[PDB]
Design a protein around this nucleic acid. Structure first.
Lengths: 85, 87
DNA sequence: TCACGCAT
DNA sequence: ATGCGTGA
């Protein structure tokens, strides 16, 4: 079934977008592909430990990690902006 | 067995996709409507202008999660630029 | 680990 | 759309 291939492809395509969006996944992809790790890349981590394996589960796990981190960051920042920290 | 370890492989992925549905606000509100749950004022605000998801399949959970990541990333710059008095 | 065909 | 089987 070609249709069934579209369902797998569309899920995989969104998996790759998370890899190219989450900093802990962008850094890992650079190592195995022999790409330059810059201080910009190290700055995007914001202290988060870079991912070692690049499977689907790790991509999802890191995406969950990045979402909660960004949330806490926004919260603390807004607490400073509204003079609440 | 190979079927058993493959079952734990498939279950492990689905456990994390369900976890995203329990974290992204556009999916939490969508889950409340499909399960006939009271959508409060705080639920609507968490969306921060993002539209709730219509379908709740795996692909929908992923695409709304990517949307939520970009929203929080944009809201950190703005919030930060102001904190540093740059704006 | 992932893709795939199938029964659901 | 998706869990399962299975070959890879």
């Amino acid at each position: 079934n070609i249709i069934e291939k579209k369902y797998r492809s569309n899920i995989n395509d969104k998996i790759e977008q998370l890899r190219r969006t989450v900093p802990t996944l962008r850094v890992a992809y650079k190592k195995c592909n022999d790409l330059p790790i810059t201080s910009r890349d190290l700055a995007d981590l914001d202290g988060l430990e870079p991912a070692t394996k690049l499977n689907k589960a790790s991509i999802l796990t890191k995406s969950i990690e990045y979402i909660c981190h960004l949330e806490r960051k926004c919260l603390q920042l807004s607490l400073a902006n509204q003079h609440l920290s």
